[PDB]
């Protein structure tokens, strides 16, 4: 049993992950694979962490998940240099995700979520 908000967050997450077929952002970045990461990025974020916050009913709004998604992309553009594959992939994923999490779409979900209460 999940709330209408949780299920909306899940379908949004499914579409966001559709824009990352390489699974660069599926799991947390470790210092082992990216040395000094924990010293450079103060608020790490990834898809699996966001999915756990959905599962635990941590998000009170779609905008909070939108904030976490922007943070995950921004983190990769801080740690990685502009020509790297990870920077370019985060740049493109952020732009694609902002179209998915547009105000127009958040609108429609808020009303249907409200109508199920
Ligand atoms: C290339 O393969 C991967 C890359 C990254 C990765 C992501 N981001 C955002 C980074 O900034 C980053 C920076 N340095 C090194 C690696 C990464 C990854 O993160 C956990 C996992 C894989 C393995 N994958 C098959 C699951």
Could you tell me the CATH number of the domain that includes residue 49?
Answer: 1.20.920.10
Task: Return the SS3 of 2.
Answer: coil
Spatial separation of the C-alpha atoms in residues 107 and 105, rounded to whole Å: 5
Experimental method: X-ray
Q: Please give the resolution of this entry in Å, rounded to 1 decimal.
A: 2.0
User: Chain-centre distance of CA 31, in angstroms?
Assistant: 20
Alpha-carbon distance of 10 to 8, in angstroms, equals 5
Cβ < 6 A, ligand 1 pocket = 23-27, 29, 33-34, 76, 79-80, 86
Angle in degrees, CA 74, 9, 31, rounded to 5: 35
User: For residue 46, what are the domain limits?
Assistant: 1-117
DSSP 8-class letter at 84 = S
Whole-number Å distance, alpha carbon 48 to ligand 1 midpoint, is: 13
Relative to the CA of 89, which ligand 1 atom is closest?
9
């Amino acid at each position: 049993e999940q709330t209408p908000l949780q299920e909306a967050l899940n379908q949004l997450m499914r579409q966001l992950q559709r824009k990352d077929p390489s699974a660069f952002f599926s799991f947390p970045v470790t210092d082992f694979i990216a040395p000094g990461y924990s010293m450079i990025i103060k608020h790490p974020m990834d898809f699996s962490t966001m999915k756990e916050k959905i599962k635990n009913n941590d998000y009170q709004s779609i905008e909070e998940l939108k904030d976490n998604f922007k943070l995950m992309c921004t983190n990769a553009m801080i740690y990685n240099k502009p020509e790297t594959i990870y920077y370019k992939a985060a740049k493109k994923l952020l732009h694609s995700g902002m179209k998915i999490l547009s105000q127009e779409r958040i609108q429609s979900l808020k009303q249907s979520i409200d109508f199920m209460a």
